[PDB]
Ligand binder design. Structure first.
Ligand code: ZN
Ligand code: ZN
Lengths: 181, 181
Protein backbone atom coordinates (compact mmCIF):
# COMPACT_ATOMS: atom_id res chain seq x y z
CA UNK A 1 0.00 0.00 0.00
CA UNK A 2 2.57 2.68 -1.02
CA UNK A 3 0.00 5.31 0.01
CA UNK A 4 -0.13 8.27 2.39
CA UNK A 5 -1.60 7.87 5.91
CA UNK A 6 -4.82 10.03 5.64
CA UNK A 7 -5.48 8.67 2.22
CA UNK A 8 -5.23 5.01 3.25
CA UNK A 9 -7.83 5.67 5.91
CA UNK A 10 -10.20 7.03 3.29
CA UNK A 11 -9.75 4.02 0.98
CA UNK A 12 -10.38 1.73 3.91
CA UNK A 13 -13.70 3.43 4.70
CA UNK A 14 -14.67 3.34 1.07
CA UNK A 15 -13.60 -0.19 0.41
CA UNK A 16 -15.50 -1.62 3.31
CA UNK A 17 -18.71 -0.24 1.85
CA UNK A 18 -18.20 -1.36 -1.70
CA UNK A 19 -19.39 -4.57 -3.40
CA UNK A 20 -16.93 -7.29 -4.37
CA UNK A 21 -17.18 -6.65 -8.04
CA UNK A 22 -16.14 -2.96 -7.61
CA UNK A 23 -13.25 -3.87 -5.36
CA UNK A 24 -11.95 -6.00 -8.22
CA UNK A 25 -12.59 -3.10 -10.60
CA UNK A 26 -10.70 -0.66 -8.44
CA UNK A 27 -7.78 -3.02 -8.31
CA UNK A 28 -7.76 -3.36 -12.10
CA UNK A 29 -8.34 0.38 -12.50
CA UNK A 30 -5.33 1.08 -10.34
CA UNK A 31 -3.10 -0.93 -12.57
CA UNK A 32 -4.52 0.58 -15.81
CA UNK A 33 -3.94 3.99 -14.22
CA UNK A 34 -0.35 3.27 -13.38
CA UNK A 35 0.40 2.66 -17.03
CA UNK A 36 -1.92 4.94 -18.99
CA UNK A 37 -1.50 8.18 -17.00
CA UNK A 38 1.28 10.83 -16.97
CA UNK A 39 1.93 14.41 -15.91
CA UNK A 40 1.79 16.78 -18.85
CA UNK A 41 5.20 18.19 -19.82
CA UNK A 42 3.54 21.57 -19.90
CA UNK A 43 0.58 22.14 -17.51
CA UNK A 44 1.12 19.20 -15.14
CA UNK A 45 -2.45 18.16 -15.55
CA UNK A 46 -3.17 14.41 -15.49
CA UNK A 47 -3.38 13.12 -19.06
CA UNK A 48 -2.55 9.97 -21.02
CA UNK A 49 -0.01 11.51 -23.40
CA UNK A 50 3.22 13.51 -22.93
CA UNK A 51 1.22 16.65 -23.76
CA UNK A 52 -2.45 17.14 -22.77
CA UNK A 53 -4.89 17.63 -25.58
CA UNK A 54 -5.46 21.12 -24.27
CA UNK A 55 -1.84 22.07 -24.57
CA UNK A 56 -1.28 20.15 -27.76
CA UNK A 57 -4.28 21.93 -29.24
CA UNK A 58 -2.71 24.85 -31.07
CA UNK A 59 -6.21 26.25 -31.51
CA UNK A 60 -6.20 27.39 -27.89
CA UNK A 61 -4.77 30.59 -26.47
CA UNK A 62 -1.39 29.55 -25.05
CA UNK A 63 -0.76 33.12 -24.04
CA UNK A 64 -3.36 32.98 -21.27
CA UNK A 65 -2.73 30.64 -18.34
CA UNK A 66 -5.30 29.59 -15.78
CA UNK A 67 -3.75 28.44 -12.53
CA UNK A 68 -5.67 25.83 -10.53
CA UNK A 69 -4.78 23.73 -7.52
CA UNK A 70 -5.86 20.42 -9.09
CA UNK A 71 -6.77 18.45 -12.22
CA UNK A 72 -10.45 18.44 -11.24
CA UNK A 73 -10.36 22.16 -11.47
CA UNK A 74 -9.30 21.91 -15.05
CA UNK A 75 -12.41 19.78 -15.45
CA UNK A 76 -14.60 22.40 -13.78
CA UNK A 77 -13.34 25.32 -15.84
CA UNK A 78 -13.75 23.29 -19.00
CA UNK A 79 -17.55 23.24 -18.45
CA UNK A 80 -17.88 26.85 -19.57
CA UNK A 81 -16.47 26.65 -23.11
CA UNK A 82 -16.14 30.42 -22.76
CA UNK A 83 -12.54 29.94 -21.69
CA UNK A 84 -10.14 29.56 -24.58
CA UNK A 85 -6.82 29.69 -22.74
CA UNK A 86 -4.58 27.05 -21.19
CA UNK A 87 -3.93 25.94 -17.60
CA UNK A 88 -1.36 25.35 -14.96
CA UNK A 89 -2.03 22.72 -12.29
CA UNK A 90 -0.26 23.49 -9.01
CA UNK A 91 -1.01 20.11 -7.43
CA UNK A 92 -1.73 21.73 -4.10
CA UNK A 93 -1.70 25.10 -2.39
CA UNK A 94 0.75 26.65 0.03
CA UNK A 95 -0.04 25.35 3.49
CA UNK A 96 2.39 25.92 6.37
CA UNK A 97 0.19 23.69 8.49
CA UNK A 98 1.01 20.68 6.26
CA UNK A 99 4.61 21.48 5.45
CA UNK A 100 3.76 22.22 1.86
CA UNK A 101 5.85 25.20 0.77
CA UNK A 102 6.02 26.87 -2.69
CA UNK A 103 8.89 24.59 -3.54
CA UNK A 104 6.61 21.55 -3.09
CA UNK A 105 3.85 22.74 -5.41
CA UNK A 106 4.40 23.56 -9.08
CA UNK A 107 5.31 27.23 -8.64
CA UNK A 108 8.82 27.16 -10.10
CA UNK A 109 7.65 25.65 -13.38
CA UNK A 110 4.92 28.33 -13.66
CA UNK A 111 7.72 30.80 -13.31
CA UNK A 112 9.78 29.05 -15.98
CA UNK A 113 6.77 29.45 -18.25
CA UNK A 114 6.86 33.23 -17.96
CA UNK A 115 10.57 33.47 -18.92
CA UNK A 116 9.90 33.57 -22.72
CA UNK A 117 7.88 36.82 -22.75
CA UNK A 118 5.16 34.83 -24.59
CA UNK A 119 2.72 34.74 -21.63
CA UNK A 120 0.36 37.67 -21.55
CA UNK A 121 -2.09 36.84 -18.78
CA UNK A 122 -2.00 34.61 -15.71
CA UNK A 123 -5.43 34.05 -14.19
CA UNK A 124 -5.31 32.77 -10.63
CA UNK A 125 -8.14 30.38 -9.93
CA UNK A 126 -7.31 28.79 -6.61
CA UNK A 127 -9.95 28.50 -3.87
CA UNK A 128 -11.48 31.51 -1.98
CA UNK A 129 -10.36 30.18 1.34
CA UNK A 130 -7.18 31.03 3.24
CA UNK A 131 -4.74 28.61 1.65
CA UNK A 132 -6.27 29.29 -1.72
CA UNK A 133 -6.13 33.06 -1.40
CA UNK A 134 -2.66 33.13 0.20
CA UNK A 135 -1.27 30.90 -2.58
CA UNK A 136 -2.82 33.32 -5.01
CA UNK A 137 -1.24 36.20 -3.07
CA UNK A 138 2.25 34.74 -3.18
CA UNK A 139 2.05 33.93 -6.88
CA UNK A 140 0.84 37.38 -7.74
CA UNK A 141 3.84 38.78 -5.90
CA UNK A 142 6.32 36.37 -7.47
CA UNK A 143 5.27 37.29 -11.00
CA UNK A 144 5.14 41.00 -10.37
CA UNK A 145 8.72 41.83 -11.51
CA UNK A 146 7.93 40.32 -14.90
CA UNK A 147 5.95 41.46 -17.88
CA UNK A 148 2.72 39.76 -17.00
CA UNK A 149 -0.89 40.71 -16.25
CA UNK A 150 -2.13 38.79 -13.23
CA UNK A 151 -5.83 38.49 -12.38
CA UNK A 152 -7.94 36.80 -9.70
CA UNK A 153 -11.19 34.97 -10.45
CA UNK A 154 -13.73 37.15 -8.60
CA UNK A 155 -15.93 36.43 -5.63
CA UNK A 156 -18.96 34.48 -6.78
CA UNK A 157 -17.61 31.36 -5.23
CA UNK A 158 -19.09 31.17 -1.70
CA UNK A 159 -17.41 31.24 1.73
CA UNK A 160 -15.17 28.21 1.37
CA UNK A 161 -16.52 26.18 -1.53
CA UNK A 162 -14.48 24.44 -4.20
CA UNK A 163 -13.65 26.03 -7.50
CA UNK A 164 -14.02 22.41 -8.58
CA UNK A 165 -17.63 21.71 -7.63
CA UNK A 166 -18.96 25.03 -8.80
CA UNK A 167 -21.68 25.25 -11.46
CA UNK A 168 -20.99 26.46 -15.00
CA UNK A 169 -23.20 29.50 -14.34
CA UNK A 170 -21.35 31.08 -11.42
CA UNK A 171 -17.90 30.09 -12.76
CA UNK A 172 -18.50 31.85 -16.08
CA UNK A 173 -19.48 34.93 -14.05
CA UNK A 174 -16.38 34.87 -11.86
CA UNK A 175 -14.14 34.32 -14.88
CA UNK A 176 -15.77 37.34 -16.49
CA UNK A 177 -15.47 39.26 -13.21
CA UNK A 178 -11.66 38.84 -12.98
CA UNK A 179 -10.05 41.56 -10.87
CA UNK A 180 -6.52 42.64 -11.65
CA UNK A 181 -3.59 42.40 -9.18
CA UNK B 1 -13.94 3.33 -9.15
CA UNK B 2 -16.02 3.19 -5.91
CA UNK B 3 -14.01 6.18 -4.71
CA UNK B 4 -14.90 9.75 -3.79
CA UNK B 5 -14.04 12.64 -6.12
CA UNK B 6 -11.17 14.13 -3.97
CA UNK B 7 -9.79 10.78 -2.77
CA UNK B 8 -9.47 9.31 -6.31
CA UNK B 9 -7.25 12.31 -7.06
CA UNK B 10 -4.64 11.80 -4.31
CA UNK B 11 -4.68 8.09 -5.04
CA UNK B 12 -3.84 8.71 -8.68
CA UNK B 13 -1.02 10.97 -7.47
CA UNK B 14 0.55 8.22 -5.41
CA UNK B 15 0.17 5.64 -8.21
CA UNK B 16 1.93 7.84 -10.72
CA UNK B 17 4.83 8.37 -8.37
CA UNK B 18 5.55 4.86 -7.13
CA UNK B 19 7.22 2.01 -9.11
CA UNK B 20 5.13 -0.45 -11.14
CA UNK B 21 6.36 -3.23 -8.84
CA UNK B 22 4.73 -1.41 -5.89
CA UNK B 23 1.53 -0.56 -7.78
CA UNK B 24 1.10 -4.30 -8.39
CA UNK B 25 1.71 -4.84 -4.70
CA UNK B 26 -0.89 -2.16 -4.11
CA UNK B 27 -3.55 -3.79 -6.26
CA UNK B 28 -3.27 -7.01 -4.31
CA UNK B 29 -3.41 -4.88 -1.13
CA UNK B 30 -6.80 -3.40 -2.10
CA UNK B 31 -8.44 -6.78 -2.46
CA UNK B 32 -6.66 -7.96 0.64
CA UNK B 33 -8.00 -4.92 2.47
CA UNK B 34 -11.53 -5.96 1.54
CA UNK B 35 -10.88 -9.44 2.94
CA UNK B 36 -9.42 -8.17 6.21
CA UNK B 37 -11.61 -5.12 6.94
CA UNK B 38 -14.44 -5.41 9.46
CA UNK B 39 -16.61 -3.68 12.13
CA UNK B 40 -15.30 -3.65 15.67
CA UNK B 41 -16.90 -6.30 17.83
CA UNK B 42 -17.34 -3.53 20.47
CA UNK B 43 -17.73 -0.07 18.97
CA UNK B 44 -18.53 -1.09 15.34
CA UNK B 45 -15.87 1.25 14.01
CA UNK B 46 -13.80 0.14 10.95
CA UNK B 47 -10.81 -2.09 11.84
CA UNK B 48 -8.64 -5.02 10.73
CA UNK B 49 -8.81 -7.00 14.02
CA UNK B 50 -11.83 -8.37 15.86
CA UNK B 51 -11.49 -5.53 18.39
CA UNK B 52 -10.49 -2.02 17.32
CA UNK B 53 -7.27 -0.37 18.51
CA UNK B 54 -9.06 1.92 20.89
CA UNK B 55 -11.47 -0.52 22.40
CA UNK B 56 -8.37 -2.68 22.89
CA UNK B 57 -6.28 -0.03 24.67
CA UNK B 58 -6.72 -0.45 28.41
CA UNK B 59 -5.44 3.04 29.16
CA UNK B 60 -8.58 4.49 27.65
CA UNK B 61 -11.61 5.21 29.85
CA UNK B 62 -13.94 2.41 28.72
CA UNK B 63 -16.58 3.88 31.05
CA UNK B 64 -17.43 6.94 28.95
CA UNK B 65 -18.88 6.07 25.53
CA UNK B 66 -18.99 8.82 22.90
CA UNK B 67 -21.82 8.05 20.50
CA UNK B 68 -21.19 8.92 16.90
CA UNK B 69 -22.84 8.31 13.48
CA UNK B 70 -19.77 7.47 11.33
CA UNK B 71 -16.11 6.23 11.37
CA UNK B 72 -14.81 9.60 10.06
CA UNK B 73 -16.62 11.04 13.01
CA UNK B 74 -14.38 9.08 15.42
CA UNK B 75 -11.52 10.39 13.35
CA UNK B 76 -12.56 13.93 14.21
CA UNK B 77 -13.08 13.39 17.93
CA UNK B 78 -9.58 11.95 17.81
CA UNK B 79 -8.08 15.31 16.98
CA UNK B 80 -9.35 16.34 20.41
CA UNK B 81 -6.43 15.00 22.42
CA UNK B 82 -8.43 15.81 25.60
CA UNK B 83 -10.93 13.06 25.02
CA UNK B 84 -9.81 9.81 26.61
CA UNK B 85 -12.89 7.63 26.38
CA UNK B 86 -14.32 5.09 23.98
CA UNK B 87 -16.84 5.35 21.12
CA UNK B 88 -19.84 3.75 19.50
CA UNK B 89 -20.45 4.17 15.81
CA UNK B 90 -24.12 4.09 14.94
CA UNK B 91 -23.61 4.05 11.20
CA UNK B 92 -26.17 6.73 10.44
CA UNK B 93 -29.23 8.17 12.10
CA UNK B 94 -32.93 7.75 12.55
CA UNK B 95 -34.18 9.33 9.35
CA UNK B 96 -37.92 9.54 8.50
CA UNK B 97 -37.01 10.75 5.04
CA UNK B 98 -34.85 7.80 3.93
CA UNK B 99 -37.02 5.43 5.91
CA UNK B 100 -34.26 4.35 8.33
CA UNK B 101 -35.53 3.26 11.78
CA UNK B 102 -33.91 2.55 15.17
CA UNK B 103 -33.61 -1.09 14.13
CA UNK B 104 -31.37 -0.15 11.18
CA UNK B 105 -28.58 1.46 13.16
CA UNK B 106 -26.46 0.18 15.98
CA UNK B 107 -28.75 1.27 18.80
CA UNK B 108 -29.48 -2.17 20.35
CA UNK B 109 -25.71 -2.82 20.52
CA UNK B 110 -25.32 0.46 22.45
CA UNK B 111 -27.81 -0.78 25.08
CA UNK B 112 -26.23 -4.19 25.57
CA UNK B 113 -23.13 -2.22 26.40
CA UNK B 114 -24.91 -0.37 29.16
CA UNK B 115 -27.08 -3.31 30.29
CA UNK B 116 -24.50 -6.08 29.94
CA UNK B 117 -21.54 -4.25 31.53
CA UNK B 118 -20.26 -1.19 33.37
CA UNK B 119 -20.76 2.27 31.82
CA UNK B 120 -20.73 5.62 33.60
CA UNK B 121 -21.58 8.14 30.88
CA UNK B 122 -22.90 8.42 27.34
CA UNK B 123 -22.01 11.51 25.34
CA UNK B 124 -24.47 11.93 22.45
CA UNK B 125 -22.46 13.35 19.53
CA UNK B 126 -24.89 12.95 16.64
CA UNK B 127 -25.43 16.00 14.44
CA UNK B 128 -27.53 18.98 15.64
CA UNK B 129 -30.24 18.69 12.93
CA UNK B 130 -33.71 17.07 13.21
CA UNK B 131 -32.29 13.71 12.27
CA UNK B 132 -29.37 13.95 14.71
CA UNK B 133 -31.63 15.32 17.42
CA UNK B 134 -34.36 12.72 17.04
CA UNK B 135 -31.69 10.03 17.13
CA UNK B 136 -30.17 11.55 20.28
CA UNK B 137 -33.58 11.89 21.91
CA UNK B 138 -34.49 8.35 21.04
CA UNK B 139 -31.38 7.03 22.68
CA UNK B 140 -31.64 9.23 25.77
CA UNK B 141 -35.17 7.91 26.15
CA UNK B 142 -33.81 4.36 26.02
CA UNK B 143 -30.96 4.97 28.45
CA UNK B 144 -33.19 6.61 31.02
CA UNK B 145 -33.99 3.36 32.88
CA UNK B 146 -30.34 2.51 33.57
CA UNK B 147 -28.29 4.82 35.73
CA UNK B 148 -25.96 6.30 33.12
CA UNK B 149 -25.31 10.05 32.92
CA UNK B 150 -26.29 11.01 29.34
CA UNK B 151 -25.02 14.26 27.88
CA UNK B 152 -25.13 16.12 24.59
CA UNK B 153 -22.62 17.97 22.48
CA UNK B 154 -23.78 21.62 22.50
CA UNK B 155 -22.82 24.44 20.09
CA UNK B 156 -21.86 22.48 16.97
CA UNK B 157 -21.37 23.47 13.34
CA UNK B 158 -23.94 26.27 13.42
CA UNK B 159 -25.25 24.60 10.27
CA UNK B 160 -26.13 22.59 8.63
CA UNK B 161 -22.69 21.05 8.91
CA UNK B 162 -21.45 17.62 10.05
CA UNK B 163 -19.38 16.77 13.12
CA UNK B 164 -16.80 15.15 10.90
CA UNK B 165 -16.22 18.52 9.23
CA UNK B 166 -15.55 20.69 12.31
CA UNK B 167 -12.60 22.44 14.02
CA UNK B 168 -10.58 20.76 16.72
CA UNK B 169 -10.93 23.88 18.87
CA UNK B 170 -14.67 23.95 18.13
CA UNK B 171 -15.16 20.31 19.01
CA UNK B 172 -12.91 20.57 22.06
CA UNK B 173 -15.24 23.30 23.22
CA UNK B 174 -18.50 21.55 22.28
CA UNK B 175 -17.20 18.57 24.19
CA UNK B 176 -16.10 20.48 27.33
CA UNK B 177 -19.69 21.79 27.58
CA UNK B 178 -21.86 18.67 27.17
CA UNK B 179 -25.03 19.09 29.24
CA UNK B 180 -27.44 16.36 30.39
CA UNK B 181 -29.93 14.83 30.01
ZN1 ZN C 1 -0.93 20.21 -20.65
ZN1 ZN D 1 -13.80 -0.66 18.90
Amino acid sequence: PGIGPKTAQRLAFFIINMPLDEVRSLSQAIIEAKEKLRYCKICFNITDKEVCDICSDENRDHSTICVVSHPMDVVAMEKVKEYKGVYHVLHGVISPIEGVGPEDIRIKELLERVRDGSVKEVILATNPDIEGEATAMYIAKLLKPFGVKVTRIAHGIPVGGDLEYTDVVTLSKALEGRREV
